[PDB]
Amino acid sequence: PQVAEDCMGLLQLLSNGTVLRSESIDLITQQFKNNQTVLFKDSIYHKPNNLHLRLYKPISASNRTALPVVVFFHGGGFCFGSRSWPHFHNFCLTLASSLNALVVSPDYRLAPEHRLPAAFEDAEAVLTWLWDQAVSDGVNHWFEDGTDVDFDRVFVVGDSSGGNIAHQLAVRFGSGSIELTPVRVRGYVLMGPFFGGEERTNSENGPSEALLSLDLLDKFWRLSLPNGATRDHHMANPFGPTSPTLESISLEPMLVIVGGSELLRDRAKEYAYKLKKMGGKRVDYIEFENKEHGFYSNYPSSEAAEQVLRIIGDFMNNLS
């Protein structure tokens, strides 16, 4: 059937997004009366793969002080998503304005065309691109304006599959493997992190969500993990028999945020508490009762979404 080549090409066109030619400004309503302007523009960070990221600058506080960096990795189960998608663009406008930080929102290669670890390799290229900009006075060319950026205050915020990406970066940075001074990642925020495993948890065997189901999560892993791999692969299960030696590596402080009704609740809770009992690991586990996957971005202007942005801000303030 040729209708199969088309549904494949549909996935590519669906998450291809667009690239802005010039810088643009949007209005974002803060926690409909209080507004805020956020400057943003697209830049290429990997020329061979034609991968772009979006930089966000809150205009009001950028001229007041040096901004910390928030690298945001969007979700999509390693198969969907783009930094230009309005759902993710709106969340980054909220991230920049509420956290008073420069937001870096990069695209990354998607499965099944680019199976894992293609997404993790792209994430490291993002941080390496950030390092290249930091040491070369490149922030001054980021906009038609000066930009003061505190590269000693970098934070990685990962949504769903981006939360998995954030964990892989935290491991690679904490193991002394990659090292990008003066870029210093002080903390990691894992928001409903897309972790997997062959054996099911109780919440994974529970009722389906508004969008997520256990069958959909299985199809995500199967289409994104390499051919012939199981859900116990280290790229899916952080505690699989491949790279579970997290006791040795020095992990940065972490924040795990999930909804109480999430299918991925038990995996993230087990992930956080296995880390809390490892020595030298500061991990805060926060569970929002009766919420499903992506409540912080699926329902903005709701109380739960605003509390998440506050918790991330407090988490950033304490770490610096």
Residue numbers in the entry: 8 to 38, 41 to 329
Original paper wording:
The overall architecture of AtCXE15 is divided into two domains: a cap domain (residues 1–21) and a core catalytic domain (residues 32–329), both of which are connected by a long linker loop (residues 22–31). The cap domain of CXE15 includes the NT α-helix (α1, we termed NTH) which is highly conserved among all CXE15 variants, while the catalytic domain adopts a common α/β hydrolase fold with a central nine-stranded β-sheet surrounded by ten α-helices and shares significant homology with rest of the members of CXEs. The catalytic triad consists of residues S169, H302, and E271, where the catalytic serine is positioned at the apex between α6 and β6. E271 is situated in the loop between α8 and β8 while H302 is in the loop between β9 and α10. The oxyanion hole is located above the active site within the conserved HGGGF motif, positioned in the loop between α5 and β5. Comparing the Ser-His-Asp/Glu catalytic triad sequence of all 20 CXEs revealed that in CXE15 aspartic acid is replaced by glutamic acid, making it the only CXE enzyme that is similar to the carboxylesterases in the animal kingdom. CXE15 exhibited significant hydrolytic activity compared to the catalytic mutants CXE15S169A and CXE15E271A, which were unable to hydrolyze YLG. Although CXE15ΔNTH exhibited some hydrolytic activity, its catalytic efficiency was drastically reduced to one-quarter of that of CXE15 due to the absence of the NTH. On the other hand, CXE15 exhibits a compact catalytic pocket shape, which is likely to enhance substrate specificity through specialized residues engaging with the substrate with the important contribution of NTH plasticity.
Arabidopsis thaliana (At) carboxylesterase 15 (CXE15) and carboxylesterase 20 (CXE20) have been shown to deplete strigolactones (SLs) that coordinate various growth and developmental processes and function as signaling molecules in the rhizosphere. Here, we elucidate the X-ray crystal structures of AtCXE15 (both apo and SL intermediate bound) and AtCXE20, revealing insights into the mechanisms of SL binding and catabolism. The N-terminal regions of CXE15 and CXE20 exhibit distinct secondary structures, with CXE15 characterized by an alpha helix and CXE20 by an alpha/beta fold. These structural differences play pivotal roles in regulating variable SL hydrolysis rates.
